[PDB]
Structures are given as structure tokens and as C-alpha cells.
Amino acid sequence: MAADILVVDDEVDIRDLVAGILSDEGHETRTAFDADSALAAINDRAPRLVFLDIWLGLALLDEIKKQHPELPVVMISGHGNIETAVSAIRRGAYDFIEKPFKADRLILVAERALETSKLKREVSDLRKRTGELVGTSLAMNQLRQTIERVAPTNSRIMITGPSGAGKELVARAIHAQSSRANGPFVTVNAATITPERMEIELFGTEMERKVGALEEAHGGILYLDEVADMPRETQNKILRVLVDQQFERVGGTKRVKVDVRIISSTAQNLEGMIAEGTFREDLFHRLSVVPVQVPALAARREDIPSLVEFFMKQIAEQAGIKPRKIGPDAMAVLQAHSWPGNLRQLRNNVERLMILTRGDDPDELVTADLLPAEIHIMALPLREARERFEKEYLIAQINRFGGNISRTAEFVGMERSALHRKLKSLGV
Amino acid sequence: MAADILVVDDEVDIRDLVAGILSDEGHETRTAFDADSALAAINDRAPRLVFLDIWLQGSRLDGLALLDEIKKQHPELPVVMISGHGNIETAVSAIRRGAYDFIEKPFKADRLILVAERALETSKLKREVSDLRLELVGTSLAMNQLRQTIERVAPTNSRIMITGPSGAGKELVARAIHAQSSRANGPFVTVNAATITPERMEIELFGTEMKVGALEEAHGGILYLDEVADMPRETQNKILRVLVDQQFERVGGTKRVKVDVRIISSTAQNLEGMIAEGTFREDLFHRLSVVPVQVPALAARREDIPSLVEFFMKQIAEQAGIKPRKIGPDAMAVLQAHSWPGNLRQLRNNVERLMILTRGDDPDELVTADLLPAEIGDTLPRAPTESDQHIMALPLREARERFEKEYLIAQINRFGGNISRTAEFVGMERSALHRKLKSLGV
């Protein structure tokens, strides 16, 4: 709300006027008469906003934007033509101010210009702490080309892949590459929605106001994450929406018509579910339009090293942990795993390794011993816990001595018959 | 974009003009002449944007009165006002009242095209942020004290020094301070010194001659120096000039750069030890340490583990779409008793692991302790095996007595030294337990 503003203009009267009003609001104002003084001001310290006069012009706008892609530029246009002013918006400008201007318009113009730039930065920052698609494999290239092909179409998509494979990312990639890219990207995850609230989540409630997924998705893309998690009750509801593109809100007569591009996804066999009568035959066909298949990590094992490299880089910009070198034995083992949970499971494992080895020297390699086993005393009171301990301890000792009860008893500090009786009492 | 836009004016020439220009641009435009007809359109379907006339003669509610109702129902729905012939003081009050912008009659067709684009672009950005995304979870006095500290020091202009072990939430406390600070709207630029090689440190912070250094980015905002203890001697002196002169020279620069930054520093290491050893500057440390904030280790706030596990599970659910499971009493007891060298980062990674590992199992099925990794389970009391060399080397009575010590200490940890709670769970009376502990000498 108190930014550093650079006001570039040929006329000192305007340079003073714009810089004055803004500085009086609480901004840090710096001024330039030409491109050479302007670029040198950016060189002193980069501003958080630029006010650029069109006629000194659009060449300076390009240089500011080439050197600083995230720096908002607002134009200073004459009363006569918004033609060049509007041309500048397309050339990269955010907005424009027309002479003569009221001080209050200028305040708002700068405020709105900064707010956007801040949001775009709040996006890049939030994105760097959270999780395009990595992979050089033939599987990945084929998927990227499928995305590139199906995204410009207006067709309904059916994304199929194992859990943690990349289905939601493919959905978002298709969205970013479609004509609805500026429109909403609304997600519906059946697994995390309660059945008692499933109707409200999809359709909303009548008149603070609760807007359902479908209404929210209007003019954009609605993502049905794991359709198989929807009960038969709500599968019918989805289908009834698919026929007419209309629905009613919960506790309301009003019927709403929306225009949504549906993207579905499943890690389940839907045809087999139709055979079991657990999923609707008509619904499946209505949703299963343009199929897109996300491959298992098992189907692109060659990417495991480049994905570990990528996740390792990602967690460094998140936790400040210096990326480590994974040993060849750990890597060999990682590459061999079935990855039931695929890329979500790979990332979690890579992270676990970063945490455990954090204290260590960067020169030391991540060894296979660190990988988890896939790659009760604490809940019990004292007497019970003591009893389980004793039982397990003796079982372990007998096995250690290969069943020689007499050798066990002597080592343990017991007499033969006493060990037999103890074992019986413990339930062995 | 193809947005659903609602056009509300009492003048038919205007409604039709706004609706016309924007529909020819690709939008879906709907018109309303009064508050009742406008609220009728919102009920039909919520638009992506509203163009609302300031005045509205002939309705139940003025333009500013309807602005309030649209915002009440849909708080995130942008509204652009329509005002005419420089009577804009009214329009700025509307902005102050919740409207994104105003367009004033008479207007150019391209001005209206640009006003709508911008209103929609901001709306979308605001939406994108909410979709990706803040609070410090804990019910413990330690946490309440920390939240009170953040609350007290966030308004001040003072430099913060946050100390705490790895993954305890020092960065979060920095973000939390920034969010409650007078620079909440300014940038929050982080420098992860442990991730930067000493040679490149000055380039990362100050930048180079014609490449923008972190300080230049953090101007008008806050610079978060993550692991200051990794600043080389040369950088230390430069940071020192930043704190006192509010200036710095770029790498290979003869030229001074002025900056207005509020530094929040952090360390997981012993800086006092480094000063004693000649690797860190004494005066720089005291200047950086004006207001110290000590983030407590997770083992020093084991009261918060159950809450944090629930929290982390909810957060994985919103991320992956996995239904939040119920943690077994065994797993929770193990998770609660643990020292957590990697603190809340390590706890989170572990909660995420159980979620991944139990995806697609029966939903009633409790998450069990045996699913947890060796660094968690093997450091705590459990049934022995032939492989446990330390236990196997001991005879029964000796193995049993060590277990009692191991078990009781673990339960004490779990119940954060609360011997009254510990006794209740293990099956003893509190004085019987104090006598047992003193006897074992644990």
C-alpha cells in the first residue's frame, strides 16, 4: 500500500503532478524525463510500479517489460486517443491514465496496479511452497502431446491413471491450455466430501450464499476427482445434470443452467464396477468421452532419477535443506519399486530422505538402509506391556538358540521346567 | 474469458450499451433495471462480475445500498460502479464500500473492455491464491505464548531474531509476523543461506552490476534471512551496513543502493558459539537480535501432537483427496512419545506417509504404529526380536528392568512430564509411580 513508484514523462509539470499526488498518499516517488534516465532509475533500484508517458514510448515499455516481466506499467495518455493507450495494454501495459485526471482516480489506478502485481507474486510464492509435468520418457512425451491435442477442443475428458500418477496435474495442464484457461477450475473430490453434504457441495443452498461446485464452475472447467468414490445416489444426480446442463439448489425450487467443461478421473476399473453394479453404465459412457491415460511410475522407471532430482530441488526452495546425492544402491532399489502410490509416494520418500540426512555432510550419499521397509506396548498399561515384552523376548531367545529350551533357560537365567511353565502361562 | 456479467443501471440506453459492448467481446451479459430485478438475476445464477449504477432512481435500494447486498451474499464477486459527469466522490466511497473500480459516463468502448478484463483478472488471481492456500496450530501454553509474542512484535519496526530447531515453524512465525505487520502488503523475500554456497551469497542478496538481489526485492517489505549463521564474514559486514546505513553496494558495484527493509532472521544453530569461535560478528548478532522469538521444539510441546496430526491429515485431504483416516491408539502413543529431531516438518511428512500407505484400505481400519518408519518405532518401546542385539545380550530380569525404564520414560514423554496422567494410563497411582521412578532412578 506504500510502494516505490517511477514516473517517466517528458513534461516536468506532469512528472511533478503524478509524483506529488502519489507521494502524498505514502508512496516513494522517483521521476525520469527519457528512456536513458528511466532505465538508469530501474538500475538505481527497481520500482514496484511505473507510470510511462506514451509520447516522449512503446519501445521503452518493451525494454522495461523485457528486463522486468513482473513490473506493472501504467500509461499516461492524452485526452484525444485511447487507441495508442489500448494498443499499449496489448504491448504489455497494465492500465492507462488520461489527462486531465482527478487525483482520486490516480490513487485507485496505482492501488489496483499494485494489488494485481502483489497477487501475481503471492501466487508465485505460494506455488513455490506447494507442488508443468516433469519426465523425459516416451510415456511422458506421449502424455504431453495428448494434453496439447485435447486441451484446445471443447470435448469432455476422462483421465485414467493409478493413484498419485498425475491425473489432477494433467487436468490443470489441459485447463491452462484450453479456451477456459481464464475461467474457473473447480474440483470435486468425492472421497473427502461427506455423503450428507454431497448435495450441497455440488448444487449449493438457496437464500452468506452457498455456491455449489457446478454453479462455481460456470464458464470454466469442473473436475470430478475419482468418480468411483461417488455413491449410486449421487451418480444419478451427476447424470441428471449431464442431460440438460441444469440443476436445483438444496432447499430451493430455482433451476440453474451452467456451461461447464467436464474433466473426470479414475484410478478404478469402471467397466468392472458396472459389472458389479457399483457404478452406472449410462453415466460411465456420458463421462468417458476423450480418454487420456496417465502412466504408472512403473511404466516410466527411467524418470525416477530425474524426478528425485526435481523433488529434491523443490524441497530445498521449501525447507532450505541442501539437495543431497542419492547413492546408486538406494537409486537402484527406488527404481525397482511398484510405487502403488506413484509420484505422491515418490515425493514423500524423497522428502523423508532430505529430513533424515539434513544434519549430515553434503558430500555423504543417501544409502539404501535409509529407505523404509516397503521400499502394542505404547497403547498398553504397565503389567500388560511387561507381559507382552517378556513373551516376545523369550520367543526371540528360543528362535535365537534354534529351539534349545535348555540353552535358552540357562542364558535367560531360568531353570528348564520354569521356562516351560512361564511359556505356557504367557500363551506360547 | 467468456464471463457471465450482470449490468445494473436505471437507464436503458446504458444497460443495453454496457451489455452490448461486453457481449460483442465474448461475454455472456444479463441486464437488470432495479435492486429486485438485480437480486433476481443473482438468484438465477451468480455472475462472475457486476456493473452497478451508483444512483438507481425508482427502486427499493440505491446503488450503494444494493452494493452492500451483492457483497453480503457473494463477498468475492467483483463490482464496478457506473457514475456520471465527475460526481466521483460518491464513486470513491463505493470503492471504500467494496466495489473493485468505477467507470464514469460518458465512456469509450475499449475503456469498458479493459475495466471488465482487470476486474475479472484480479477476481481470478484472488481465487487462484485461495485454491493453493497460515495459522499456527497448538492449544499448549507454549503456543499461546508464541502467538502473543507474534501479536506484540508484529506492529513494531524492530528486527526479529527467531531461534528454534529444524522444522519447528520459524519461517511460519516470520510469515505470521509479516501478515500482522505494517508491511503486510509489502514483499516477503526469503534467503535460504543453508541452500546458497558462500561464494554466491553476496550475489543472491545484493545482486550484480548490469540480477536483482533479495534486498532490492524486499524493499518496502520484509527480508527473511533463513539460517543467518551461514552468512560468510564479507556478507556479515554488508548486512551490517544495511542495518545502519540502509544502503549497500552490488557485487562489482561502485554504486550505492538505498533500501527500506525490516529484517527477520532465523537460526537452528548456536550463534553465540560461533561468536565465541570467531566465525560470526558480535555487533551484527546483537543488532539482528533486538527482539528474540524462541520457537519451542516439538518434544517440548507434545500436548500439540494429537491436534497437529488431525491438522496435517485435514491438510493432506485438501491436497490429495484422501479421506482422513482414524489413527490407532498405538500409532498416536508412539507419535506423541517421540523426540522429533526434524520437528513439525518430520511430523507432517510422517502423517502424509501414513495417509499414502493406508489409501485404498477399509475406511474403518485404524492406522497402526507398525506402518511408521524405523526412526520412529525403533527409538521407542516395542516387542524384541532376535535382531535386537542389545536386548538379546541381556538375561530375562535385566531385559525386563530395562524395559520398565524405557516404557515409563516413553509414557512420561507422551504425557509431557505429567506423572498424574502417566500413572493413570500405565495403571498406577501417582505416588506409587514417583516411588517406582525414584527406585529405577529414571
Ligand SMILES: Nc1ncnc2c1ncn2[C@@H]1O[C@H](COP(=O)(O)OP(=O)(O)OP(=O)(O)O)[C@@H](O)[C@H]1O
Ligand atoms: N509429471 C510430473 N512431474 C512432477 N510432479 C508430478 C508429476 N505428476 C505428478 N506430480 C506430482 O505428484 C503428486 C501426484 O498428485 P496428482 O495431482 O497427480 O494426483 P493424482 O494422480 O490424480 O492422484 P491422487 O490425487 O489420487 O493422489 C503431486 O504432488 C504432483 O504435483
Ligand SMILES: Nc1ncnc2c1ncn2[C@@H]1O[C@H](COP(=O)(O)OP(=O)(O)OP(=O)(O)O)[C@@H](O)[C@H]1O
Ligand atoms: N505451530 C504450527 N502449527 C501448524 N503447522 C505448523 C506450525 N509450525 C510450523 N508448521 C508447519 O510445519 C512445517 C514447519 O515449517 P517451517 O519452515 O515454518 O519451519 P522452520 O523452523 O523454519 O524450519 P525449516 O524451514 O528449516 O524446515 C511447515 O510445513 C509448516 O506448515
Ligand SMILES: [Mg+2]
Ligand atoms: Mg506526458
Ligand SMILES: [Mg+2]
Ligand atoms: Mg442511471
